[PDB]
Amino acid sequence: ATNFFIQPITEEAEAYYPPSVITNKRKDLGVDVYCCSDLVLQPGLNIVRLHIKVACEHMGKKCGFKIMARSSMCTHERLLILANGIGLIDPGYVGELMLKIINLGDTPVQIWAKECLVQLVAQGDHVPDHINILKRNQIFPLF
Amino acid sequence: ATNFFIQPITEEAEAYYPPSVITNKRKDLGVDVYCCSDLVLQPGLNIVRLHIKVACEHMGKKCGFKIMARSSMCTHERLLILANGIGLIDPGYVGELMLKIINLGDTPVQIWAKECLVQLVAQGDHVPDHINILKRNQIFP
Amino acid sequence: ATNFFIQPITEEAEAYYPPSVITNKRKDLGVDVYCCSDLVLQPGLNIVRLHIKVACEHMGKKCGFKIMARSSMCTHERLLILANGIGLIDPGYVGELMLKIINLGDTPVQIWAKECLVQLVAQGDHVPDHINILKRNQIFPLFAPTPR
Ligand SMILES: O=c1ccn([C@H]2C[C@H](O)[C@@H](COP(=O)(O)O)O2)c(=O)[nH]1
Ligand SMILES: O=c1ccn([C@H]2C[C@H](O)[C@@H](COP(=O)(O)O)O2)c(=O)[nH]1
Ligand SMILES: O=c1ccn([C@H]2C[C@H](O)[C@@H](COP(=O)(O)O)O2)c(=O)[nH]1
């Protein structure tokens, strides 16, 4: 099996990540993840904090995962790309998930809290079975 | 085994995709796909229809795949990138493939139908064994 | 197991890649890789040679790998992206590894030889066990019977 573990680490993040076990019955490859707060993306590089700590596991072992833009991220009203193409998250990383987004236009772009600009893909592109939303301040499960 | 299934939608796409079975003797990871139409990429974002329906399978079961730019897509004369970095195609997706291409230059760029700007990589990067080009008016296996 | 093999080509690449076997105790997915030469990235597309020969193997067989930008490659001061998003390296490729880097800014950007702008990831995202830095005068492995 392949499972994700997402823990909100701020107040605004808790509103979008209440404790739950989410099943991927549609069997999509990506796990959508929220902005959790309104933000304005200036032209050029923007550092976006996702306000979550994430773990991925495959066959009982902690693995890495990848951050990929959703197709909806770039539109005619927002010329947005992920600076690093895809974000490579190593299994040893236990910090907060971050995004480097380049606004390629000359116009600042308003992003809303509920929007999901990116999705998480497990190492090896394995379909996630469950997305476990952990409680804030809890210790992550052992793998 | 890992196999791709490509079905042309338009008459022009059928010209570039006649029914056949292509073998991946070189053992390449990506499956180059034609644009299947001449097109002009305006500066900024461009929505490009590939005029094909694609399914990927791994060990008898339908799987997802990924759309990746080819090295030749970007040159000194055309600054083209895929807007989403790589396209993530879920196994449940059954519609026509599409590309979001950003022309970073200030002048329109002409692309020919025979050009392969992008390649398809199976979920998990499994190397394809066969690329099945299907007839236009049939249903997927 | 999954292992990478790196052989420097130029003199300065040899200075950055002396013979050694690097173990991936952190179990990181990416293998950081040096520029091996000072370079100036002009606005627009830049074709960059990595000055190394690279192979990846998985369960005794040669496999492909992927070139991914590191998070450190793009900063507020240098707007650098990989033109193809990620570089897909087929196992047959054996030639020298190339980069297509777009400088999105209006002024040239200086990169130092010691900087690691990109990282290599094995086919299927398998975590590498060892990273073998080969001498310039030793045989590069083929991982297969000599074909045809
Ligand atoms: O888009 C990204 C890329 C990386 N990281 C974190 C997780 C990685 O383990 C660590 C190192 O990333 P790189 O330097 O290898 O890109 O930074 C992110 O939070 N977001
Ligand atoms: O480049 C792309 C990316 C996605 N899709 C289709 C297939 C996916 O299943 C669906 C959703 O993609 P995301 O929103 O997850 O990127 O859109 C494309 O046609 N082209
Ligand atoms: O960033 C890249 C991408 C590709 N290649 C080489 C290795 C591949 O086997 C070959 C074909 O690449 P594509 O045309 O499939 O992108 O070019 C590189 O050196 N660097």
Numbering used by the authors:
A (entry chain A): 2 to 144
B (entry chain C): 2 to 142
C (entry chain B): 2 to 149
Copy out sentences from the published article reporting this entry, exactly as the authors wrote them.
However, we obtained the crystal structure of E165R-dUMP complex rather than E165R-dUTP complex at a resolution of 1.70 Å, with Rwork and Rfree values of 18.8% and 21.5%, respectively. This result further confirmed that E165R has a pyrophosphatase activity that degrades dUTP into dUMP and pyrophosphoric acid. Each of the three dUMP binds to the interface of two protomers of the E165R trimer. dUMP interacts with N85, G88, L89, I90, D91, Y94, and M99 of one E165R protomer and R71, S72, and Q120 of another protomer. Among these interactions, N85, D91, and M99 from one protomer form hydrogen bonds with the deoxyuridine part of dUMP, while S72 and Q120 from the other protomer form hydrogen bonds with the phosphate group of dUMP. The secondary structure of the E165R protein in the E165R-dUMP complex is very similar to that of apo-E165R, except that the C-terminal 310 helix in apo-E165R is missing in the E165R-dUMP complex. In contrast, these values become 127.0 Å2 and 62.2 Å3, respectively, for the binding pockets in the E165R-dUMP complex. However, we did not found any magnesium ion, free pyrophosphoric, or phosphoric acid groups in the binding pocket of the E165R-dUMP complex, just like in other dUTPase-dUMP complexes.
ASFV encodes a dUTP nucleotidohydrolase (dUTPase) (dUTP pyrophosphatase [Dut]; EC 3.6.1.23), called E165R. The enzyme degrades dUTP in the cytoplasm and thus minimizes misincorporation of uracil into viral DNA, which plays an essential role in maintaining the fidelity of genome replication. It is indispensable for reproductive infection of ASFV in swine macrophages, the natural host cell for the virus. We show that E165R is a homotrimer and can specifically hydrolyze dUTP.
